[PDB]
Design a protein around this motif. Sequence first.
Motif, mmCIF file in Angstrom:
data_model
loop_
_atom_site.group_PDB
_atom_site.id
_atom_site.type_symbol
_atom_site.label_atom_id
_atom_site.label_comp_id
_atom_site.label_asym_id
_atom_site.label_seq_id
_atom_site.Cartn_x
_atom_site.Cartn_y
_atom_site.Cartn_z
ATOM 1 N N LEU A 64 20.606 -29.071 28.909
ATOM 2 C CA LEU A 64 20.244 -29.236 27.550
ATOM 3 C C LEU A 64 20.818 -30.600 27.031
ATOM 4 C CD1 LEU A 64 20.729 -25.933 25.742
ATOM 5 C CD2 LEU A 64 18.537 -26.871 26.102
ATOM 6 N N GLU A 65 21.928 -31.175 27.468
ATOM 7 C CA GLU A 65 22.696 -32.352 26.636
ATOM 8 C C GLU A 65 22.172 -33.307 27.255
ATOM 9 O OE1 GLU A 65 27.128 -32.153 26.343
ATOM 10 O OE2 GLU A 65 26.505 -32.776 24.339
ATOM 11 N N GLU A 66 21.835 -33.399 28.743
ATOM 12 C CA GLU A 66 21.308 -34.532 29.342
ATOM 13 C C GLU A 66 19.899 -35.029 29.596
ATOM 14 O OE1 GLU A 66 23.425 -34.605 33.302
ATOM 15 O OE2 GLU A 66 25.179 -33.705 32.240
ATOM 16 N N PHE A 67 18.862 -33.687 29.275
ATOM 17 C CA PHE A 67 17.531 -33.830 29.771
ATOM 18 C C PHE A 67 16.761 -35.003 28.631
ATOM 19 C CE2 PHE A 67 13.003 -32.548 29.543
ATOM 20 C CZ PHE A 67 12.607 -32.714 30.776
ATOM 21 N N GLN A 68 16.697 -36.373 29.007
ATOM 22 C CA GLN A 68 15.834 -37.207 28.331
ATOM 23 C C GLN A 68 14.342 -37.022 28.271
ATOM 24 O OE1 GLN A 68 18.323 -40.525 30.088
ATOM 25 N NE2 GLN A 68 17.890 -41.365 28.127
ATOM 26 N N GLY A 88 12.930 -41.376 25.963
ATOM 27 C CA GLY A 88 14.285 -41.533 26.150
ATOM 28 C C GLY A 88 15.232 -41.005 25.434
ATOM 29 N N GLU A 89 14.897 -40.248 24.113
ATOM 30 C CA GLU A 89 15.581 -39.235 23.472
ATOM 31 C C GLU A 89 15.926 -38.295 24.155
ATOM 32 O OE1 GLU A 89 14.156 -39.142 19.467
ATOM 33 O OE2 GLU A 89 15.088 -41.271 18.912
ATOM 34 N N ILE A 90 16.894 -37.184 23.931
ATOM 35 C CA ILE A 90 17.082 -35.937 24.534
ATOM 36 C C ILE A 90 16.132 -35.009 23.794
ATOM 37 C CG2 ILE A 90 18.969 -34.078 24.923
ATOM 38 C CD1 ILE A 90 20.077 -37.570 24.547
ATOM 39 N N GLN A 147 16.742 -32.801 19.552
ATOM 40 C CA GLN A 147 15.985 -33.031 18.338
ATOM 41 C C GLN A 147 15.506 -31.472 17.844
ATOM 42 O OE1 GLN A 147 12.689 -32.476 17.685
ATOM 43 N NE2 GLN A 147 12.633 -33.373 15.655
ATOM 44 N N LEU A 148 14.947 -30.783 18.591
ATOM 45 C CA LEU A 148 14.319 -29.289 18.406
ATOM 46 C C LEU A 148 15.417 -28.443 17.895
ATOM 47 C CD1 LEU A 148 12.058 -28.713 21.636
ATOM 48 C CD2 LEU A 148 11.184 -29.442 19.185
ATOM 49 N N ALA A 149 16.740 -28.576 18.495
ATOM 50 C CA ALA A 149 18.010 -27.665 18.214
ATOM 51 C C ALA A 149 18.376 -27.853 16.390
ATOM 52 C CB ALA A 149 19.116 -28.137 18.962
ATOM 53 N N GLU A 150 17.771 -28.871 15.733
ATOM 54 C CA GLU A 150 18.103 -29.346 14.531
ATOM 55 C C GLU A 150 17.469 -28.306 13.804
ATOM 56 O OE1 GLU A 150 18.951 -33.214 13.044
ATOM 57 O OE2 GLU A 150 18.213 -33.825 15.160
ATOM 58 N N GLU A 151 16.407 -27.558 14.213
ATOM 59 C CA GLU A 151 15.593 -26.440 13.101
ATOM 60 C C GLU A 151 16.401 -25.234 12.867
ATOM 61 O OE1 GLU A 151 11.739 -25.983 14.732
ATOM 62 O OE2 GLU A 151 10.990 -28.043 14.020
ATOM 63 N N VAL A 194 8.877 -25.719 33.083
ATOM 64 C CA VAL A 194 8.592 -27.084 34.188
ATOM 65 C C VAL A 194 9.673 -28.060 33.665
ATOM 66 C CG1 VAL A 194 6.181 -26.483 34.386
ATOM 67 C CG2 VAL A 194 6.853 -28.025 32.288
ATOM 68 N N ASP A 195 10.275 -28.294 32.498
ATOM 69 C CA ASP A 195 11.274 -29.206 32.113
ATOM 70 C C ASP A 195 12.397 -28.660 32.802
ATOM 71 O OD1 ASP A 195 9.684 -30.798 30.461
ATOM 72 O OD2 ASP A 195 10.534 -29.926 28.446
ATOM 73 N N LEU A 196 12.753 -27.330 32.833
ATOM 74 C CA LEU A 196 13.896 -26.924 33.618
ATOM 75 C C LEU A 196 13.785 -27.193 34.907
ATOM 76 C CD1 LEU A 196 16.344 -24.983 33.739
ATOM 77 C CD2 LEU A 196 14.682 -22.999 33.884
#
Lengths: 283, 190
Positions: free
Chosen positions: B18-22, B26-28, B32-36, B50-52
Amino acid sequence: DKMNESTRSVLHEVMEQQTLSIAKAGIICQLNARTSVLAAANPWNPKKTTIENIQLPHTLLSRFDLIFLLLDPQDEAYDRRLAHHLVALYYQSEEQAEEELLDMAVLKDYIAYAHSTIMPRLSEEASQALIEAYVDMRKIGSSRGMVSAYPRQLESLIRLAEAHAKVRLSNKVEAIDVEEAKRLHREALKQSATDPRTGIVDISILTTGMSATSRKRKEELAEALKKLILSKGKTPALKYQQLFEDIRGQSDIAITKDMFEEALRALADDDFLTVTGKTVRLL
Amino acid sequence: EVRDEVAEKCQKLFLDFLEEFQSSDGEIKYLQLAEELIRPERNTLVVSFVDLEQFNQQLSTTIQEEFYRVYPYLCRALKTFVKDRKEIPLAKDFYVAFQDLPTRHKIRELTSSRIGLLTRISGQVVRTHPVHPELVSGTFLCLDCQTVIRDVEQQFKYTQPNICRNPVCANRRRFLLDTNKSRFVDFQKV
Ligand SMILES: [Zn+2]
């Protein structure tokens, strides 16, 4: 022939829209129902055409691509051949049952293969022949100053020609298919839509449920009824039974209660009279 | 004392994912989604399978093969990750949900072979029932000695303590649920 009105309604929906709609007990949905119908129906009476004999409406009967009639021919040779075929079936044996079974299996394979890969597409010759067939059917009505073809007839010819092309395993639909489609369509029209009163195909049988003869008779009866009421027009109300007896005393045809009431209903829709029980009143 | 090593390794690796996947840019992405989740109405974070997959095949495979055993540890990872960034009332709890799964199974393939494994199906809904609140973690007050018992986690039948940590109590039945500090979740059947 003896399905109820609700069944007829849902059948109409399925054959027009190729889907079925449901809304009950909280369930609301639409289903795919693209199915090929093959139906067997019953009333014989040669004095009247098929739709004039059987129960069902022209809304449904006008949807079939082809219509066929089955009855005995009163032929000695036909009975002899049928009885001989029956006797042969009485002695039916493995010496030919196995051959028929093998051909049936091969036919299943043939149909499955053809259905799996073959797509007939139009040719210039087939397009010309199909256009000419539609023109022939429009021309057939021109002598009577009336319609005798519309696009649904052309769709039936196209579907039959494509099927015949697929039977030949041809990827092209061509004049061979269209001439056979015209033959089948013409034969079907002859047997299904002939008026036995004239020996001629009357399209209004298939699009309205009756020969034009019936239409003319009904109109003439309505005019005679109107003239009878007008001849007694000094009176505002005339008795139903008296009018029936007047008409039946002046007509050559033995007019029925239904014919008399249909004429009264027609004149009421024309705003000429109102039927109040046993009394007919002028407007 | 005892620890499920496989589960602990999954927790650590999923937090790193979660913390490293750009993103492609280039942004993680999931930062960004977690802020909701700051909103009162929001509880669930959606993660693409597929990201996982792109991080490491071993983690992807382990999650699918060991889902029911591993699932509560993924929630703790998300809880930790969100708590770092922005202020939220600490009593709130968070959920992880996966989609873009590569395969599909028929209803008649669902059999006792795959109890507990991550799976995907499709069907037509016939009936749907009301919403109710479901208890997930109870707080009880032991009346005979006035001592509270916390985070009594539930299973299918409603369970509670019967003897407290306070030894002089000698109680068996006099326990009171704290319906103000217990926590619930919404539940529905179809
Ligand atoms: Zn106690």
